[PDB]
């Protein structure tokens, strides 16, 4: 309850938590990323950040005497690895000794307009750089704060804040039931996708295409990313079920935007998208449905929208675009990811998503992960 509405931002500019670092404390805005495992802050001035962590001003700051380079899908940074005391004002009332990387060089990491000046990698030890032996932030917090090995996210920034609950589930942040999908591999939050349906129509694809090379839940990825073959099938299915007579090829790639004049909204011209996930009882599945309000994103009185789905080389990424419709539980202690209906996930007083189940897995393989 102390952690309710402790995030700021949206899928576009990222969801970020306020953190107090060092002695005396310096306040920073930290991006919540379930796609990486390093805690890093800007340590020198930069053109697209208004604040940075100054290690010279901290009496508790200690250097490990080595560097680290971390590469993402979009962006990279190089920093010194050190240690310092951290407090999370909104939630905890005690300090923690954590590993911290101070960025002194970056390439397409800190972009213009962003309100955050650091990153919080909430994924597993396996992804920590330089190695797995570099204690992650959440591993330090679970050990030092006496909390269950669970965290949950409620993203409320769809269209035109949120909550990061460290240590549990807040019942006031969801409605109905929680559906759980097993974590297949503990590196990223890798889950199993069984089927995709556009306007109630199933794609003509083997369930393995969806887990090529992995299907993950990532709060640091803006859009829904699909392997090229899956992506082409989705574009074909969306165009067929849409009320827009013809589309320009650049709309699908992000090179062209769809612009409506007057006060007119796009959402009634597009179908729903459903993703089927395996339940904890393998004979069952549940589906998470997103309405156009989540995948048709705002950017002569024109209002322009981009396609909120992008092709990927070898990964299906459930971005902050999909997470904006649900209360998502990262249940590390029980090796599972939970999804629930989020009351805050609504634009113009209407739901932007749905959750339904159970369904039969008989028409699909016992394992869809190649």
């Amino acid at each position: 309850l102390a952690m309710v509405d402790n995030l700021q931002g949206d899928s576009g500019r990222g969801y970020y938590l306020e953190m107090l670092i060092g002695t005396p404390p310096q306040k920073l805005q930290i991006l919540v990323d379930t796609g990486s495992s390093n805690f890093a802050v800007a340590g020198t001035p930069h053109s697209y950040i208004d604040t940075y962590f100054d290690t010279e001003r901290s009496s508790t700051y200690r250097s490990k005497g080595f560097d680290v380079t971390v590469k993402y899908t979009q962006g990279s940074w190089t920093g010194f690895v050190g240690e310092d005391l951290v407090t999370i004002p909104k939630g905890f009332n005690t300090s923690f000794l954590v590993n911290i990387a101070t960025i002194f060089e970056s390439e397409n990491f800190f972009l213009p307009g962003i309100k955050w000046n650091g990153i919080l990698g909430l994924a597993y030890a396996t992804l920590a750089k330089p190695s797995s032996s570099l204690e992650t932030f959440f591993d330090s917090l679970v050990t030092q704060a006496n909390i269950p090995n669970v965290f949950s996210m409620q993203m409320c920034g769809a269209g035109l804040g949120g909550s990061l609950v460290l240590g549990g589930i807040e019942p006031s942040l969801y409605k109905g039931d929680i559906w759980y999908t097993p974590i297949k591999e503990e590196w990223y939050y890798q889950i199993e996708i069984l089927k995709l349906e556009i306007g109630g129509q199933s794609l003509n694809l083997d369930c393995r295409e969806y887990n090529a090379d992995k299907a993950i839940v990532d709060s640091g990825t803006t859009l829904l990313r699909l392997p090229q073959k899956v992506f082409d099938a989705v574009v074909e299915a969306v165009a067929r079920a849409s009320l827009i007579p013809a589309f320009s090829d650049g709309f699908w790639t992000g090179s062209q935007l769809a612009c409506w004049t007057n006060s007119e909204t796009p959402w009634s011209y597009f179908p729903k998208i459903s993703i089927y996930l395996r339940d904890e009882n393998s004979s069952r599945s549940f589906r998470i449905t997103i309405l156009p309000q989540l995948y048709i994103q705002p950017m002569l009185n024109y209002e322009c929208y981009r396609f909120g789905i992008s092709p990927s080389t070898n990964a299906l990424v459930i971005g902050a675009t999909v997470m904006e419709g649900f209360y998502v539980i990262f249940d590390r202690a029980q090796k599972r990811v939970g999804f629930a209906a989020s009351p805050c996930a609504e634009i113009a007083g209407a739901a932007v998503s749905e959750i339904s189940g159970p369904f039969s897995t008989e028409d699909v393989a016992s394992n869809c992960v190649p």
Partner: nanobody, 111 residues
Framework: QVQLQESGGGLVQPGGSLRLSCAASGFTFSSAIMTWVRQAPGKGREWVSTIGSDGSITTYADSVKGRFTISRDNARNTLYLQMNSLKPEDTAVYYC?????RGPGTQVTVS
């Protein structure tokens, strides 16, 4: 991989003392944050103490402050916990932990 092994646990009377040790291998110990955690019967896991890689930065749970002292010898790859003025509430399996890994533990009983 990361290897940790605790020792020095025993059975003492209230007011007693114990010196816990933890031997580490498989990772660069001299570059790691080290923690002591305890698990008492019928209660949840409780954080005891944390020490920074060079030993200068130390933190303690309010329940152990002034009674326990965490230390480390980086040349010898060993972490320590000096437990003085022991009380029955301190009965627990004490674990040595780093980067999600723990040792097999060391049982402490205070009559």
């Amino acid at each position: 991989q990361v290897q940790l092994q605790e020792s020095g646990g025993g059975l003492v009377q209230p007011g007693g003392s114990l010196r816990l040790s933890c031997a580490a291998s498989g990772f660069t110990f001299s570059s790691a944050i080290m923690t002591w955690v305890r698990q008492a019967p019928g209660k949840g896991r409780e954080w005891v103490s944390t020490i920074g890689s060079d030993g200068s930065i130390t933190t303690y749970a309010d329940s152990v402050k002034g009674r326990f002292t965490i230390s480390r010898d980086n040349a010898r790859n060993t972490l320590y916990l000096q437990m003085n003025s022991l009380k029955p509430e301190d009965t627990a399996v004490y674990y040595c932990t780093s980067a999600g890994r723990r040792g097999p533990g060391t049982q402490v009983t205070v009559s």
